Short mmCIF file of C-alpha atoms in Angstrom, two decimals:
data_model
loop_
_atom_site.label_atom_id
_atom_site.label_comp_id
_atom_site.label_asym_id
_atom_site.label_seq_id
_atom_site.Cartn_x
_atom_site.Cartn_y
_atom_site.Cartn_z
CA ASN A 5 14.64 -24.27 98.95
CA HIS A 6 17.96 -26.34 99.66
CA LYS A 7 16.49 -29.52 100.52
CA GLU A 8 15.69 -30.76 97.04
CA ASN A 9 17.55 -34.12 96.59
CA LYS A 10 17.91 -34.45 92.64
CA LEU A 11 18.77 -37.79 91.54
CA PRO A 12 21.29 -38.53 88.56
CA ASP A 13 19.75 -40.00 85.59
CA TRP A 14 21.15 -43.60 86.15
CA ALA A 15 19.73 -44.04 89.54
CA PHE A 16 16.35 -45.56 90.82
CA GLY A 17 13.94 -43.19 92.25
CA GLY A 18 12.27 -41.64 93.87
CA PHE A 19 10.31 -44.31 95.99
CA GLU A 20 7.22 -43.03 97.05
CA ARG A 21 5.71 -44.73 100.58
CA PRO A 22 1.79 -45.33 99.46
CA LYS A 23 -0.93 -43.52 101.75
CA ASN A 24 -2.35 -45.90 104.60
CA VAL A 25 -0.30 -48.87 103.64
CA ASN A 26 2.77 -49.08 106.12
CA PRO A 27 3.91 -51.02 107.91
CA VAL A 28 3.02 -53.95 105.55
CA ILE A 29 4.32 -56.34 108.18
CA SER A 30 4.56 -56.02 111.78
CA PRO A 31 5.24 -58.64 114.82
CA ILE A 32 2.34 -60.81 115.93
CA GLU A 33 2.02 -62.13 119.40
CA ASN A 34 -0.59 -65.33 118.94
CA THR A 35 1.22 -67.29 115.95
CA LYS A 36 2.98 -70.14 117.21
CA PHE A 37 5.82 -72.54 115.74
CA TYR A 38 7.22 -75.98 117.27
CA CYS A 39 10.89 -75.32 116.98
CA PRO A 40 12.68 -78.89 116.30
CA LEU A 41 15.83 -77.39 118.19
CA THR A 42 14.19 -76.01 121.36
CA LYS A 43 11.57 -78.95 121.26
CA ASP A 44 8.76 -76.64 122.20
CA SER A 45 6.29 -74.05 121.03
CA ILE A 46 7.32 -70.51 120.33
CA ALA A 47 5.88 -67.31 119.33
CA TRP A 48 8.69 -67.14 116.56
CA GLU A 49 7.44 -63.38 115.12
CA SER A 50 6.21 -61.80 118.35
CA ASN A 51 9.07 -59.36 118.92
CA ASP A 52 10.34 -58.28 115.22
CA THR A 53 9.52 -58.68 111.56
CA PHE A 54 12.15 -56.83 109.37
CA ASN A 55 15.07 -57.06 106.86
CA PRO A 56 13.18 -58.89 103.94
CA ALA A 57 13.71 -60.57 100.88
CA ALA A 58 11.32 -60.09 97.84
CA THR A 59 10.84 -61.69 94.57
CA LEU A 60 8.45 -62.75 91.73
CA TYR A 61 6.65 -65.96 91.93
CA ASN A 62 3.24 -67.07 89.80
CA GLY A 63 2.24 -63.28 89.08
CA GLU A 64 2.74 -62.26 92.90
CA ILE A 65 5.03 -60.70 95.10
CA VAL A 66 6.40 -62.97 97.66
CA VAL A 67 8.31 -61.73 100.54
CA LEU A 68 10.50 -63.68 103.12
CA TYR A 69 10.88 -61.63 106.34
CA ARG A 70 13.43 -62.05 109.21
CA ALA A 71 11.33 -62.63 112.21
CA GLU A 72 12.46 -62.87 115.99
CA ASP A 73 11.07 -64.23 119.24
CA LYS A 74 11.53 -62.44 122.51
CA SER A 75 14.00 -65.30 123.35
CA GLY A 76 16.53 -62.92 124.23
CA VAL A 77 17.37 -59.12 125.34
CA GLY A 78 19.09 -56.95 122.60
CA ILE A 79 21.20 -57.24 119.43
CA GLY A 80 21.56 -60.52 117.92
CA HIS A 81 20.38 -62.74 121.06
CA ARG A 82 17.10 -63.69 119.64
CA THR A 83 16.76 -66.51 117.13
CA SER A 84 15.94 -65.53 113.61
CA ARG A 85 13.74 -67.69 111.36
CA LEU A 86 12.03 -66.51 107.91
CA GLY A 87 8.44 -65.76 107.55
CA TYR A 88 6.49 -66.15 104.19
CA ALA A 89 4.18 -63.51 102.78
CA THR A 90 2.34 -63.33 99.42
CA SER A 91 0.79 -59.87 97.81
CA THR A 92 -1.21 -59.47 94.59
CA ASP A 93 -0.71 -55.80 94.49
CA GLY A 94 2.60 -55.20 96.43
CA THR A 95 1.37 -53.42 99.20
CA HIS A 96 -1.14 -55.99 101.30
CA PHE A 97 0.33 -59.14 102.30
CA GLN A 98 -1.01 -62.48 103.17
CA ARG A 99 1.38 -64.37 105.48
CA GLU A 100 1.81 -67.87 106.72
CA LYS A 101 1.41 -68.52 110.60
CA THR A 102 4.68 -70.45 110.64
CA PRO A 103 8.10 -70.05 109.37
CA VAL A 104 9.37 -71.47 106.12
CA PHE A 105 13.21 -71.22 106.84
CA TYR A 106 14.67 -71.85 109.98
CA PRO A 107 17.89 -73.78 112.09
CA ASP A 108 17.11 -77.38 112.38
CA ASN A 109 18.70 -80.50 113.23
CA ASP A 110 20.29 -80.58 109.88
CA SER A 111 23.82 -80.29 108.56
CA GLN A 112 23.95 -76.45 109.50
CA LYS A 113 23.05 -76.58 113.03
CA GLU A 114 26.54 -75.50 114.36
CA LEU A 115 26.39 -72.55 112.05
CA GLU A 116 23.01 -71.40 112.51
CA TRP A 117 22.09 -72.10 116.27
CA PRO A 118 20.95 -70.05 118.20
CA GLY A 119 21.24 -66.98 116.20
CA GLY A 120 19.19 -68.38 113.29
CA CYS A 121 18.88 -67.50 109.61
CA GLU A 122 18.89 -63.63 109.10
CA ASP A 123 18.76 -60.93 106.54
CA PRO A 124 17.68 -62.86 103.07
CA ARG A 125 18.38 -61.65 99.60
CA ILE A 126 16.62 -63.70 96.70
CA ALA A 127 17.33 -63.54 93.16
CA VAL A 128 15.91 -65.98 90.45
CA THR A 129 17.32 -67.77 87.32
CA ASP A 130 16.05 -67.68 83.85
CA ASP A 131 14.38 -71.23 84.44
CA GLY A 132 12.98 -70.41 88.12
CA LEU A 133 15.59 -71.40 90.49
CA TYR A 134 15.49 -69.17 93.50
CA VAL A 135 18.66 -68.44 95.24
CA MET A 136 18.63 -67.11 98.59
CA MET A 137 21.92 -65.48 100.08
CA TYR A 138 21.49 -64.99 103.84
CA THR A 139 23.40 -65.00 107.22
CA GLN A 140 24.04 -67.83 109.34
CA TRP A 141 24.27 -66.80 113.18
CA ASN A 142 25.61 -69.00 116.04
CA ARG A 143 26.49 -66.02 118.25
CA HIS A 144 30.06 -66.41 117.45
CA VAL A 145 30.69 -65.99 113.45
CA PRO A 146 28.20 -64.72 110.90
CA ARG A 147 28.50 -66.29 107.55
CA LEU A 148 27.03 -65.72 104.07
CA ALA A 149 25.28 -68.91 103.17
CA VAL A 150 23.28 -70.12 100.17
CA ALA A 151 20.08 -71.76 100.18
CA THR A 152 17.89 -72.78 96.78
CA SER A 153 14.19 -73.45 96.09
CA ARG A 154 11.88 -73.55 93.24
CA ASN A 155 8.50 -72.82 95.39
CA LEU A 156 10.04 -70.39 98.06
CA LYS A 157 8.93 -72.81 100.74
CA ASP A 158 10.92 -76.03 100.50
CA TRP A 159 14.55 -74.87 100.93
CA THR A 160 17.80 -76.63 100.21
CA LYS A 161 20.71 -75.44 102.47
CA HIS A 162 23.95 -75.62 100.80
CA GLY A 163 26.13 -74.07 103.65
CA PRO A 164 28.54 -71.08 103.51
CA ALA A 165 29.04 -69.45 100.00
CA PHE A 166 32.69 -69.36 100.45
CA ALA A 167 33.12 -72.87 102.14
CA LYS A 168 35.18 -74.27 99.48
CA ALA A 169 36.89 -71.39 97.82
CA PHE A 170 40.57 -71.47 97.93
CA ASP A 171 40.94 -74.76 99.77
CA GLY A 172 38.88 -73.54 102.59
CA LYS A 173 40.69 -70.40 103.11
CA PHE A 174 37.39 -68.16 103.85
CA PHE A 175 35.35 -71.05 105.81
CA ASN A 176 35.76 -68.87 108.93
CA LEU A 177 35.08 -65.50 107.37
CA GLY A 178 33.02 -63.30 109.16
CA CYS A 179 30.54 -61.99 106.47
CA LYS A 180 27.06 -61.31 105.35
CA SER A 181 24.58 -59.45 102.89
CA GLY A 182 25.20 -60.80 99.23
CA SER A 183 23.53 -58.93 95.97
CA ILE A 184 23.74 -61.14 93.02
CA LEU A 185 23.87 -59.65 89.64
CA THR A 186 20.65 -59.62 88.01
CA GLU A 187 18.96 -57.83 84.68
CA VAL A 188 15.34 -57.43 83.57
CA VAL A 189 14.80 -59.36 80.35
CA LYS A 190 11.29 -59.40 78.92
CA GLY A 191 9.70 -57.96 81.84
CA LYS A 192 11.63 -60.19 84.27
CA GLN A 193 14.36 -59.56 86.85
CA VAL A 194 16.73 -62.69 86.49
CA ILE A 195 20.12 -63.73 87.72
CA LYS A 196 22.81 -62.35 84.82
CA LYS A 197 25.90 -63.78 83.95
CA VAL A 198 29.02 -61.50 83.05
CA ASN A 199 32.18 -62.71 81.58
CA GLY A 200 31.00 -66.41 81.53
CA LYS A 201 30.36 -66.43 85.39
CA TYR A 202 27.65 -65.76 87.81
CA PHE A 203 28.48 -62.23 89.87
CA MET A 204 27.85 -61.03 93.25
CA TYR A 205 28.51 -57.69 95.39
CA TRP A 206 28.90 -58.41 99.08
CA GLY A 207 29.84 -57.13 102.45
CA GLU A 208 29.02 -54.95 105.33
CA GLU A 209 32.04 -52.81 106.28
CA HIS A 210 33.19 -52.86 102.65
CA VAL A 211 31.68 -53.67 99.44
CA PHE A 212 33.48 -56.64 98.14
CA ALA A 213 32.52 -58.98 95.03
CA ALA A 214 32.60 -62.69 94.29
CA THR A 215 32.03 -65.24 91.33
CA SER A 216 30.49 -68.60 90.74
CA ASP A 217 30.03 -71.25 88.09
CA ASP A 218 26.83 -72.66 89.91
CA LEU A 219 25.40 -70.11 92.03
CA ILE A 220 26.27 -72.45 95.28
CA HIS A 221 29.96 -72.24 95.36
CA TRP A 222 31.38 -68.54 95.41
CA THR A 223 34.80 -67.40 95.03
CA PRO A 224 35.77 -64.03 96.36
CA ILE A 225 37.64 -61.49 94.21
CA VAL A 226 40.97 -61.25 95.64
CA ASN A 227 44.20 -58.99 95.25
CA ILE A 228 47.64 -60.13 94.20
CA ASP A 229 48.45 -61.15 97.77
CA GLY A 230 45.07 -63.04 98.15
CA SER A 231 43.36 -60.26 100.61
CA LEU A 232 39.93 -59.50 99.83
CA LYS A 233 39.64 -56.87 97.15
CA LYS A 234 37.74 -53.50 98.18
CA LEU A 235 35.64 -52.00 95.46
CA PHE A 236 34.62 -49.21 97.76
CA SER A 237 34.31 -48.28 101.35
CA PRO A 238 32.75 -46.07 104.06
CA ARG A 239 33.94 -42.34 103.64
CA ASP A 240 34.37 -39.45 106.14
CA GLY A 241 31.81 -36.88 106.24
CA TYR A 242 28.80 -38.52 104.64
CA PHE A 243 25.92 -40.79 105.68
CA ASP A 244 27.75 -43.95 104.59
CA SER A 245 30.95 -43.31 106.91
CA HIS A 246 30.83 -46.58 109.13
CA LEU A 247 29.23 -49.16 106.83
CA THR A 248 28.53 -49.62 103.09
CA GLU A 249 26.37 -52.64 103.31
CA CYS A 250 24.97 -54.33 100.09
CA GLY A 251 21.01 -54.22 99.66
CA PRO A 252 18.92 -55.95 97.28
CA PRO A 253 20.49 -57.75 94.35
CA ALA A 254 22.34 -55.50 91.91
CA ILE A 255 20.88 -54.52 88.50
CA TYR A 256 22.54 -54.40 85.43
CA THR A 257 21.07 -51.51 83.22
CA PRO A 258 21.78 -49.75 79.91
CA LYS A 259 23.72 -46.70 81.92
CA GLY A 260 25.76 -49.23 84.10
CA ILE A 261 25.27 -51.87 86.91
CA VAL A 262 23.42 -50.23 90.06
CA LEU A 263 23.86 -51.61 93.55
CA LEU A 264 21.50 -50.18 95.95
CA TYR A 265 22.83 -50.26 99.41
CA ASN A 266 22.73 -49.20 103.14
CA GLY A 267 25.12 -46.65 104.73
CA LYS A 268 25.39 -46.53 108.50
CA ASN A 269 26.47 -42.93 109.67
CA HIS A 270 29.54 -42.79 111.97
CA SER A 271 29.37 -40.83 115.15
CA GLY A 272 33.08 -39.46 114.97
CA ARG A 273 33.60 -39.62 111.10
CA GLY A 274 30.27 -39.27 109.78
CA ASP A 275 27.71 -36.36 108.79
CA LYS A 276 25.73 -34.90 111.64
CA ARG A 277 23.26 -33.63 108.95
CA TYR A 278 21.90 -37.24 109.51
CA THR A 279 21.25 -39.35 112.69
CA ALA A 280 24.37 -41.08 114.30
CA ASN A 281 24.59 -44.99 113.97
CA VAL A 282 21.64 -45.54 111.52
CA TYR A 283 20.98 -46.51 108.22
CA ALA A 284 19.97 -44.52 105.05
CA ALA A 285 19.83 -46.23 101.67
CA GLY A 286 22.17 -45.01 98.74
CA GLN A 287 23.27 -46.21 95.40
CA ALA A 288 26.60 -46.96 93.62
CA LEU A 289 27.12 -47.11 89.95
CA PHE A 290 29.42 -49.82 88.31
CA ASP A 291 31.04 -50.33 84.82
CA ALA A 292 28.71 -52.62 82.58
CA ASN A 293 31.56 -54.44 80.90
CA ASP A 294 33.64 -54.77 84.11
CA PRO A 295 31.33 -55.13 87.33
CA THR A 296 34.14 -54.48 89.85
CA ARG A 297 34.90 -51.07 88.10
CA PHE A 298 33.43 -48.40 90.47
CA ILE A 299 31.96 -45.36 88.78
CA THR A 300 30.38 -43.33 91.36
CA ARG A 301 27.85 -43.20 94.41
CA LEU A 302 25.19 -40.71 95.49
CA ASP A 303 26.60 -38.09 97.90
CA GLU A 304 23.24 -38.11 99.63
CA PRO A 305 20.75 -41.14 100.67
CA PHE A 306 17.68 -41.21 98.32
CA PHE A 307 15.72 -42.91 100.89
CA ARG A 308 16.02 -42.33 104.69
CA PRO A 309 13.76 -42.52 107.83
CA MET A 310 10.79 -40.00 107.20
CA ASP A 311 7.56 -41.59 108.87
CA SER A 312 6.85 -42.51 112.51
CA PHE A 313 6.19 -46.43 111.46
CA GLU A 314 10.32 -46.34 110.27
CA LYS A 315 10.77 -45.04 113.95
CA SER A 316 10.73 -46.46 117.50
CA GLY A 317 11.30 -45.72 121.32
CA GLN A 318 14.62 -47.68 120.56
CA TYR A 319 15.29 -45.63 117.50
CA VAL A 320 13.66 -42.02 118.13
CA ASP A 321 14.94 -40.74 114.61
CA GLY A 322 14.13 -43.96 113.01
CA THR A 323 16.42 -46.12 110.64
CA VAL A 324 15.84 -48.11 107.27
CA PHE A 325 17.42 -51.14 105.80
CA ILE A 326 16.76 -51.94 102.12
CA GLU A 327 16.80 -55.30 101.25
CA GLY A 328 13.98 -56.66 98.68
CA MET A 329 13.03 -55.46 95.33
CA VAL A 330 10.59 -56.28 92.63
CA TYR A 331 9.75 -55.18 88.99
CA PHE A 332 5.88 -55.51 89.07
CA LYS A 333 3.42 -54.28 86.87
CA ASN A 334 5.89 -51.86 85.21
CA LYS A 335 6.68 -50.18 88.80
CA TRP A 336 9.64 -50.87 91.11
CA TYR A 337 8.42 -52.16 94.72
CA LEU A 338 11.37 -51.51 97.36
CA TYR A 339 10.89 -53.49 100.60
CA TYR A 340 12.93 -52.63 103.75
CA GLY A 341 13.35 -53.10 107.38
CA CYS A 342 11.85 -50.17 109.69
CA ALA A 343 13.78 -49.67 113.06
CA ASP A 344 14.72 -53.22 113.08
CA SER A 345 11.17 -54.10 113.89
CA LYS A 346 8.69 -53.87 110.98
CA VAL A 347 8.67 -54.10 107.22
CA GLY A 348 7.95 -51.18 104.86
CA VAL A 349 7.44 -50.64 101.09
CA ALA A 350 7.93 -47.85 98.89
CA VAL A 351 6.98 -47.70 95.00
CA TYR A 352 9.15 -46.15 92.12
CA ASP A 353 7.26 -45.46 88.80
CA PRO A 354 9.56 -45.23 86.01
CA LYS A 355 6.97 -43.31 83.73
CA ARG A 356 6.26 -40.73 86.33
CA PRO A 357 9.34 -40.63 88.65
CA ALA A 358 8.53 -38.79 92.10
CA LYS A 359 11.32 -36.85 94.10
CA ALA A 360 13.59 -38.75 96.51
CA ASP A 361 13.34 -37.86 100.11
CA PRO A 362 14.39 -34.33 100.79
CA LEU A 363 17.60 -33.40 102.43
CA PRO A 364 17.23 -32.86 105.94
#
């Protein structure tokens, strides 16, 4: 009656959850991995498999999922490693039994041990260079870092994204969640340049931005006084009242640049229509000619917890965190974390758009 969640003509959606497919990736007890830092075998994906990256490779959808062992108690006390899975249809995945990206006795050990490597986002260049933006976690400072690959298995760690910018001014900056700007060209979503440089939206507490000449060394967009330039922020009385966290890579379209993001509801300044302290997905629109120029955002989340697989004993009313997205066989596949423990998929079909999740 009053629960119809109409989307404006610039937004993606609705993303419909296919019947009997979810969750697509869940924790596995039996799979073991020899951790070079722990010096012992561990059930690296026995507790949680969530917050995934997604991309296209060899006519197949590849997903890298954040996996955690039972090495700790609660929030950020386990070790995160990235699992690898491939799919021919976007709904059924074939996983490897060992992680493809993890902390090791390499140049990033101090930054990645013992929290590991979290929440990946992957975009690909015109020529097949996959660029991963992920979080380095050592239980002290979270850092947005970069890793490159050509086969999505053998990764090269380049360290924190903002390590060199302005003489190392932001090396110790606590940050995460980087959504590189992309565009669909000849049926393929690739990293796009604007104004001569590569571009990225990033942040958890606010949506910031950054540019780069080589996709490795990023320079944050700053104000006259050198402070980080806030593009938009959490707002009172809405679902995105505590956090406005970047989701999958941003997409340059004819109507403008769309950033799909995750909003966390504030318990004191949020909207009680939605669950407190959990995530629901939103979308923001930026000017095509100026990517830092905010136009608008959705007043209601387009995707939120609806089914039991997106819920748990820990999160009774559920929580979803969008992070992977692939244009495959003329449809959009959205990959997201479910209750910080499973991976889910939802599909948007441009030729027959479904309704978004209804309002509560």
